[model samples]
Target: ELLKPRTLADLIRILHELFAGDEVNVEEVQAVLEAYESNPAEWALYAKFDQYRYTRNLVDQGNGKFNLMILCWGEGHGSSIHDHTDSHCFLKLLQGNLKETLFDWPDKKSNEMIKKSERTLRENQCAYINDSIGLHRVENVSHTEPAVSLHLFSPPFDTCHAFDQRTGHKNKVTMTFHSKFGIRTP
Candidate 1:
């Protein structure tokens, strides 16, 4: 369906519309989190990811949506280049900084991966996307403090396609995750 989410209400309406006949799904929860909501109190934990603290927050709305959370990250913590199949996604940063790497797909299967194409979001920033973009991922490059962010997906996020820069081989696999919330991450 073509969703025009020009405002938070529009996004919520679209989400509620998709969930009218249906129960709340993971996608819907993601839309809510990625909406115009930002809680600074929740961000206090994002800076504890250092050696002093190793933690993660995961949630499953059970309404068909699941949430993946990374509230805190020390320097050099991030994800490799990857993409989802038939999934829409959004992310929110409660604290610290994050660098989102975007890539251009030359073909449906492969594409030229580029960095610095755009900074996905910084502190108090967020992002969303459909199936149009090729591949992308986020990373925590802060040398001073830790970075924190949350991701939401509808129908839950599943297996994805990833690439090995060293082996130069594409591999399709499942993601391993852990969540403190009621949602299942793995």
Candidate 2:
């Protein structure tokens, strides 16, 4: 289905409406899950959308405020292990199946970077991007169709660290910054 918002402005309006409601503050981050439970089309904008050689999009509204991004991936494509460096975000699935593996460091000693602890997310499911317990990789497992999802972040997502699980090493990288698809430093 085509986006009812017509323009990005209208789409942002809907997000603002949702954010302004008392409901936004009254529920857990998971409450956003219900936003997609009933109307899957709300995420159509992201599910069917795509860009060349990237996985997601981040719309900046300017200053410290900005629109979150929607990530779209084809079969056999996935993200590398990474952390948001103190950013808050939410996600809603629009199509296909997804796999989000979680990890925790043996110690919260800041430098004690974590490793795979567990996993969350599957196809056609809505979930909040786990930021508090942040650190994991996201994947798409559909064999025939592409996987799509919408994400929201406050103050917008800028530079972040992508992890290399091999050799038990982590490196901080600056994102090139695109309106959609995340910071690609690899």
Candidate 3:
């Protein structure tokens, strides 16, 4: 059974154990995310959203080992089918609901992604992706209510590739943060 972590520090301790090795077990990471019960009182400093774009708020940049952040989703906010390049990502839904869809690449050279499976995640549910996983999309399920999710990435990446689902085109984009700690930025 997964041990519940009521605070961020407690959560970090669990993650540290799971990520101690070179190869990260996806199952272990998912379990850690599932076990985390975020306290809004402790998370208030890192949560904010924008209607025009999804926001990434800093939680902790783990001393050159990993990075933790909260992704705030406004109504209808979603990501395009994308890959993390070389990094592994763990996501935990902390509020509202999210519609996550997985896809397959018929050809590694093409941007066309074949819809494989889709699932809706509610509060406390977890999901993850790595280099082996083809592509995926995450969207806020509610049209009016905002959603929040925690994300953890090892050896934080500065860029990732995003594919155009309809046009089979790919592009590398630099990552941006909505806020670092409690300070807002573009």
Q: Which candidate's lDDT is highest?
A: 3
Local accuracy of candidate 3 as per-residue lDDT tens digits, 1-186: 358777878888777777677777778778878877767787878898887878899877776668899999988999977888678888898888999988775465655566799999889988888768767889996878899999998878878877788755778988899888788876
* Candidate 1 lDDT score at position 149: 71
Q: Write the per-residue lDDT of candidate 1 for residues 49-85, one digit (tens) a residue.
A: 4463334555334345443455556676776677766
lDDT of all the models against the reference? 0.57, 0.55, 0.82
Pairs that clash in candidate 2 = 56-180, 56-181, 57-180, 57-181, 58-179, 58-180, 97-123, 103-117, 105-114
RMSD of candidates 1 onward, in order: 6.2, 6.2, 2.1
**Residue 79 in model 2: lDDT:** 75
Q: State TM-scores per candidate.
A: 0.65, 0.65, 0.90
Stretches of model 2 off by over 4 angstroms after superposition = 1-14, 17-29, 37-54, 59-66, 106-120, 176-186
Give candidate 2's total backbone clashes: 9
Please give the lDDT score at residue 142 for candidate 1. 72
